[PDB]
Paper text:
GlmM is a phosphoglucomutase enzyme catalyzing the conversion of glucosamine-6-phosphate to glucosamine-1-phosphate, which is subsequently used to produce the essential peptidoglycan precursor UDP-N-acetyl-glucosamine.
The B. subtilis GlmM protein displayed a four-domain architecture typical for phosphoglucosamine mutase proteins. While one GlmM molecule was present in the asymmetric unit, the typical “M-shaped” GlmM dimer arrangement was observed in the crystal cell packing. Interactions were formed between domains 1, leading to the formation of a large groove at the top of the dimer molecule, mostly formed by domain 2 and the active site of each monomer subunit facing the opposite direction. Two different structures were solved for the B. subtilis GlmM protein at 2.9 and 3.0 Å resolutions with a superposition r.m.s.d. score of 0.29. The B. subtilis GlmM structure further highlighted the flexibility of the most C-terminal domain 4, which was found in the most open conformation seen in any GlmM protein structure up to date.
Numbering used by the authors:
A (entry chain A), B (entry chain A): 2 to 446
The structure:
């Protein structure tokens, strides 16, 4: 009915995301991808979550009961699953994980031959079957049955590829890594050490219970302190599945996905590699990202939140680069989903080639301050129109005239409305927001 | 209701023995064995059957959804599973296989802590649960979930143990091996080669479709020809799971489980190791086995067909050795189920120590000829009594007076009765059987 959301199937493993269901998934989904040849070739990959194994076995059982030849990969980032499912011309690819969420949660994700999430048509049918109450799909027996050749060497192919996209070894750089105790634990540390960089690690020590546990892109303050401690040049914080990246500069400060997009797209434009010198990004990006983009003559396209949209955009118009503030950047020259380590290597290429420190590079793009004030109200949904509100906003919008931005939306969870303001400084934020907030409390209370 | 038969659960994999059911098994059975500690320790092992993997994954999924720490072993004979489940003090042990059957079939088998099939009480409850239609067993989540550490090194521990029970290396012996393309493929050939024996192989080349395919204990004629071809001293034919053994002498002839029991128990008695110098065996054994046993002053106990009974017997009365004509011999000094390779090493110990060739040793025990004649009849079940039949038999029984044996039983499959006769020679068989057969056709036709 509705198993496949944004990020595939998710639940708390065993309770909601039962192995029964991870069976039905691989069984039916392997049927759907079976329409080509009698013997599809799914490959499957997972992070360090303890539920990993339980799901991987039930999923592979499903796949094998409908003839699919199956290639376990072991622990590997979602990037590497997509890269390999393309490079090995495999009918599909699967990733058991639930990036950056806590360990108890997990999820199944699918990739097609091309390295892209499955067509909404396909997922459609997978769900069609998963609600019939008769498993009338074929049951091959004897020699028709699925086959299963492990391929734990997959990892070092996706390593072998990342290693070629580094414009020279990184000698002379001290990098700290925090790998969320996840799929990137063993991949990253081999990579940057095989690229001749002084690596200092942390969060690289998974036990299947510690993924994303005060480490990783979502919790970068540990890494913030570790950089200063080990006095490194920068810190990289991947998340659970190796699909995001948040950096940290020698000064200890955080370097979100807008600043990484800025930094990298700018370097890329200096090699002629930025395609039509444009960059896709989402609403969520910070006004000062668009400002410093103009300043470097890089144009931009905005899309709605979520990388199905940011990738929908780069596809048609053939764009080279696109990203989110989350740290989720796509370099389509190289791979078809967000790739933490790719991001990180592009960032290091920048650093090496410019001899600047990460603080300097990220200072070109100046973030605008934000401000949120939430006011409790009687009837939060009647703010869509108002004889005052609706007006106030518009005036302040024009008063700002490109140097600012306002956003007022009612909450779901509660009975209050959220006023929010980008401005060039903290005191303009304060002025503007207070204005709107006043004409709201006039109505409600 | 009735899933656990003699040899565990069996079916044709996927069609009857579905992965769904191999899930319910490990889930419920891991509950039943969970009553001790919150974190049982099942270990699991399989043969080369292609359905192996599919079942192993669904089974491990079950086990993990109820907290069991689980130890994959890979491919290993059922012997080695039992040996290890004892030596590692593990709550249970599991073997996915269906020995000597064709590849399409498979099966789940259970062993307790002690190395013995599970108590009929336990299997009882496993089935109790498997027919409730509500999976109300706990669903641990987060850190309670199952854990899974592979242990593919298990194999070479059970090797390390077999290698100690060989009374000296086997230098100077040429042995041919036929391992049914099964679990014993890699174990045997390392073993006898690490014991310094000239090994010539066959059936050692599994691809998950060729198990028991004109090789192995059930189909020994290939091996019969191979021994003569490679002019070896003897041939060993294990079956799919490494639980049986049939030998073949340098002359090419077959050496069934009665002759191996004779040969080995006799050697053992010569080391004082045969306990109370007795040997357990089943009805199925050949009169001349009992004769040559008397001749060497070894006493004997008979039990009904099947090793649950042959082991029930050695348990109470503390017997050292017991076997079946199948090749399924138990040496309880050393292990708790039938052990093909153990048998084989005991046989080689005999050979080495006596310097005799296998033909000579197996000639001490002289088999009596058998004869079967099946007569079609009108009402095959009224032969339990007869005014002629019942008499004829009894007379011929006493006429034989210990030198013979008769057995007449009606068939199920068809409408006819089966007359059968052991005698000292082929022409006594012919006489005796013809007598009975005559007084049967008198009635029926």
């Amino acid at each position: 009915g509705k198993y496949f959301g944004t990020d595939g199937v998710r639940g708390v493993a065993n309770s909601e995301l039962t192995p029964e269901l991870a069976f039905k998934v691989g069984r039916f989904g392997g049927y759907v991808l079976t329409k080509d040849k009698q013997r599809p070739k799914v490959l499957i990959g997972r992070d360090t979550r303890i539920s990993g194994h339980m799901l991987e076995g039930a999923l592979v059982a499903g796949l094998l009961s409908i003839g699919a030849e199956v290639m376990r990969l072991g622990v590997i980032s979602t990037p590497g699953v997509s890269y390999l499912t393309k490079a090995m011309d495999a009918e599909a690819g699967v990733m058991i994980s639930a990036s950056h969420n806590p360990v108890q949660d997990n999820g199944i994700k699918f990739f097609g031959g091309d390295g892209f999430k499955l067509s909404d048509e396909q997922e459609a049918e997978i769900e069609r079957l998963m609600d019939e109450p008769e498993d009338k799909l074929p049951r091959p027996v004897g020699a028709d049955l699925g086959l299963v050749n492990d391929y734990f060497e997959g990892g070092q192919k996706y390593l072998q590829f990342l290693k070629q996209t580094a414009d020279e070894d990184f000698t002379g750089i001290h990098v700290a890594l925090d790998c969320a105790n996840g799929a990137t634990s063993s991949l990253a540390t081999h990579l940057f050490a095989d690229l001749d960089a002084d690596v200092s690690t942390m969060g690289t020590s998974p036990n299947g219970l510690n993924i994303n546990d005060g480490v990783g892109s979502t919790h970068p303050e540990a890494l913030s302190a570790f950089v200063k401690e080990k006095n490194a040049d920068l810190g990289l914080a991947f998340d659970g599945d190796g699909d995001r990246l948040i950096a940290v500069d020698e000064k200890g400060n955080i370097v979100d996905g807008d600043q990484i997009m800025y930094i990298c797209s700018k370097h890329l434009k200096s090699e002629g590699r930025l395609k039509d010198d444009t960059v896709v990004s989402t609403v969520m990006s910070n006004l000062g990202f668009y400002k410093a983009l103009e300043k470097e003559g890089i144009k931009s396209v905005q899309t709605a939140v979520g990388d199905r949209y940011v990738v929908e955009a780069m596809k048609k118009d053939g764009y080279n680069v696109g990203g989110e503030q989350s740290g989720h950047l796509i370099f389509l020259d190289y791979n078809t989903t967000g790739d933490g380590l790719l991001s990180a290597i592009m960032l290091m290429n920048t650093l090496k080639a410019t001899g600047k420190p990460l603080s300097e590079l990220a200072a070109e793009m100046q973030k605008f301050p934000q401000l949120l004030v939430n006011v409790r109200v009687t009837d939060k949904y009647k703010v869509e129109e108002n004889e005052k509100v609706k007006a106030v906003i518009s005036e302040v919008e024009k008063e700002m005239n490109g140097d600012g931005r306002i956003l007022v939306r009612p909450s779901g969870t509660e009975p209050l409305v959220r006023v929010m303001a980008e401005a060039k400084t903290k005191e303009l934020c304060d002025e503007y927001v207070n204005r709107i907030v006043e004409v709201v409390r006039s109505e409600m209370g």
